[PDB]
Design an enzyme around this catalytic site. Structure first.
Site, PDB file in Angstrom:
ATOM      1  N   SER A  61     -12.110 -20.243  -5.187  1.00 34.21           N
ATOM      2  CA  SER A  61     -10.693 -20.054  -4.614  1.00 34.21           C
ATOM      3  C   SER A  61     -10.730 -20.686  -3.238  1.00 34.21           C
ATOM      4  O   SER A  61      -9.783 -21.169  -2.483  1.00 34.21           O
ATOM      5  CB  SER A  61     -10.383 -18.531  -4.857  1.00 34.21           C
ATOM      6  OG  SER A  61      -9.675 -18.331  -6.236  1.00 34.21           O
TER       7      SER A  61
ATOM      8  N   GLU B 115       0.892  -1.450  -0.104  1.00 37.00           N
ATOM      9  CA  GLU B 115      -0.064  -0.025  -0.103  1.00 37.00           C
ATOM     10  C   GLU B 115       0.790   1.420   0.075  1.00 37.00           C
ATOM     11  O   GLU B 115       0.207   2.383  -0.366  1.00 37.00           O
ATOM     12  CB  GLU B 115      -0.860   0.071   1.094  1.00 37.00           C
ATOM     13  CG  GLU B 115      -1.955  -0.997   1.284  1.00 37.00           C
ATOM     14  CD  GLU B 115      -2.819  -1.072   0.055  1.00 37.00           C
ATOM     15  OE1 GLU B 115      -3.091   0.020  -0.498  1.00 37.00           O
ATOM     16  OE2 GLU B 115      -3.933  -1.847   0.173  1.00 37.00           O
TER      17      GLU B 115
ATOM     18  N   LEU C 158      -8.691   3.959   2.820  1.00 40.55           N
ATOM     19  CA  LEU C 158      -9.763   4.304   1.991  1.00 40.55           C
ATOM     20  C   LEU C 158     -10.646   5.311   2.470  1.00 40.55           C
ATOM     21  O   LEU C 158     -11.183   5.031   3.571  1.00 40.55           O
ATOM     22  CB  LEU C 158     -10.635   3.234   1.239  1.00 40.55           C
ATOM     23  CG  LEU C 158     -11.900   3.665   0.562  1.00 40.55           C
ATOM     24  CD1 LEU C 158     -11.396   4.473  -0.889  1.00 40.55           C
ATOM     25  CD2 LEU C 158     -12.681   2.313   0.410  1.00 40.55           C
TER      26      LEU C 158
ATOM     27  N   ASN D  65      -6.971 -20.256  -9.854  1.00 41.79           N
ATOM     28  CA  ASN D  65      -8.292 -19.852 -10.112  1.00 41.79           C
ATOM     29  C   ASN D  65      -8.351 -18.243  -9.272  1.00 41.79           C
ATOM     30  O   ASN D  65      -9.083 -17.158  -9.891  1.00 41.79           O
ATOM     31  CB  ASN D  65      -9.143 -20.478  -9.129  1.00 41.79           C
ATOM     32  CG  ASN D  65     -10.547 -20.065  -9.152  1.00 41.79           C
ATOM     33  OD1 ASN D  65     -10.915 -19.175  -8.083  1.00 41.79           O
ATOM     34  ND2 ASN D  65     -11.164 -20.486 -10.325  1.00 41.79           N
TER      35      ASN D  65
ATOM     36  N   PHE E 287      -8.240  -6.412   2.965  1.00 38.86           N
ATOM     37  CA  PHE E 287      -7.762  -5.138   3.122  1.00 38.86           C
ATOM     38  C   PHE E 287      -7.906  -4.406   1.636  1.00 38.86           C
ATOM     39  O   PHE E 287      -8.659  -3.338   1.803  1.00 38.86           O
ATOM     40  CB  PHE E 287      -6.225  -5.118   3.650  1.00 38.86           C
ATOM     41  CG  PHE E 287      -6.088  -3.722   4.101  1.00 38.86           C
ATOM     42  CD1 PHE E 287      -5.701  -2.885   3.038  1.00 38.86           C
ATOM     43  CD2 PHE E 287      -5.682  -3.409   5.621  1.00 38.86           C
ATOM     44  CE1 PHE E 287      -5.088  -1.535   3.308  1.00 38.86           C
ATOM     45  CE2 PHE E 287      -5.495  -2.205   5.784  1.00 38.86           C
ATOM     46  CZ  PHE E 287      -4.960  -1.270   4.731  1.00 38.86           C
TER      47      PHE E 287
ATOM     48  N   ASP F  56      -6.416   6.223  -4.979  1.00 40.46           N
ATOM     49  CA  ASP F  56      -5.830   4.839  -4.883  1.00 40.46           C
ATOM     50  C   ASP F  56      -5.989   4.264  -6.599  1.00 40.46           C
ATOM     51  O   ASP F  56      -6.238   4.932  -7.579  1.00 40.46           O
ATOM     52  CB  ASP F  56      -6.591   3.890  -4.081  1.00 40.46           C
ATOM     53  CG  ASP F  56      -8.251   3.959  -4.304  1.00 40.46           C
ATOM     54  OD1 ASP F  56      -8.481   3.954  -5.507  1.00 40.46           O
ATOM     55  OD2 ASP F  56      -8.937   2.844  -3.687  1.00 40.46           O
TER      56      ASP F  56
HETATM   57  C1  LIG Z   1      -9.924 -15.721  -0.798  1.00 38.43           C
HETATM   58  C2  LIG Z   1      -8.817 -15.589   0.144  1.00 38.43           C
HETATM   59  B1  LIG Z   1      -9.301 -15.386   1.630  1.00 38.43           B
HETATM   60  C3  LIG Z   1      -9.841 -14.223   2.382  1.00 38.43           C
HETATM   61  C4  LIG Z   1     -10.347 -14.318   3.842  1.00 38.43           C
HETATM   62  C5  LIG Z   1     -10.339 -15.750   4.193  1.00 38.43           C
HETATM   63  C6  LIG Z   1      -9.653 -16.784   3.456  1.00 38.43           C
HETATM   64  N1  LIG Z   1      -9.349 -16.661   2.342  1.00 38.43           N
END
Ligand SMILES: CCB1C=CC=CN1
Ligand SMILES: [Cl-]
Ligand SMILES: [Cl-]
Length: 161
Positions: free
Chosen positions: A117, A11, A32, A132, A104, A20
């Site tokens: 994912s 960041e 933000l 993915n 974040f 941003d």
């Molecule tokens: C997709 C990533 B992820 C974001 C928060 C918790 C678990 N995995």
């Protein structure tokens, strides 16, 4: 390396209001302020966040205070989210940092939509998850950062940082 140092790399640190990667008024370490196009609206959110009349400029201490709050909020959001929490709890601490990084950047809404994912991560199918994760607007708009976060999910190391 840890989540604070990771997000500080991703960041940056700017002590005056800036836009941003999406064009939204931001300050500090990726704090933000608003999606409104009005700079005055952004300055109002900044004053409210800091507790004084800043006129768009903060100190490094103030930036780090917002940053610690924002990291905490990202974690606490993950843990309140029924989709994200089980995947987060299944991860090692390094991959947990990658998960916080995404929240974040994108907000818990959006990351919770990475349904396929999330499932691959929970299954520890690391290479499949990495493939993915890159099939995303996120990867296409911020590829160097997404590549670092994805490498962290793929390897469970800090090699990309
Ligand atoms: C997709 C990533 B992820 C974001 C928060 C918790 C678990 N995995
Ligand atoms: Cl605040
Ligand atoms: Cl990037």
């Amino acid at each position: 390396m840890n989540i604070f140092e990771m997000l500080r790399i991703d960041e940056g640190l700017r002590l005056k209001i800036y836009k941003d990667t999406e064009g939204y008024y931001t300050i500090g370490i990726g704090h933000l302020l608003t999606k409104s196009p009005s700079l005055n609206a952004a300055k109002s959110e900044l004053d409210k966040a800091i507790g004084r009349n800043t006129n768009g400029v903060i100190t490094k201490d103030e930036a780090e205070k917002l940053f610690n709050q924002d990291v905490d909020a990202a974690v606490r959001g993950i843990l309140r989210n029924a989709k994200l929490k089980p995947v987060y709890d299944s991860l090692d601490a390094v991959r947990r940092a990658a998960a916080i990084n995404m929240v974040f950047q994108m907000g818990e809404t959006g990351v919770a939509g990475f349904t396929n994912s999330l499932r691959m991560l929970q299954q520890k199918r690391w290479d499949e998850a990495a493939v993915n994760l890159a099939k995303s607007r996120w990867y296409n708009q911020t590829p160097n950062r997404a590549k670092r976060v994805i490498t962290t999910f793929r390897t469970g190391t800090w090699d990309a940082y």
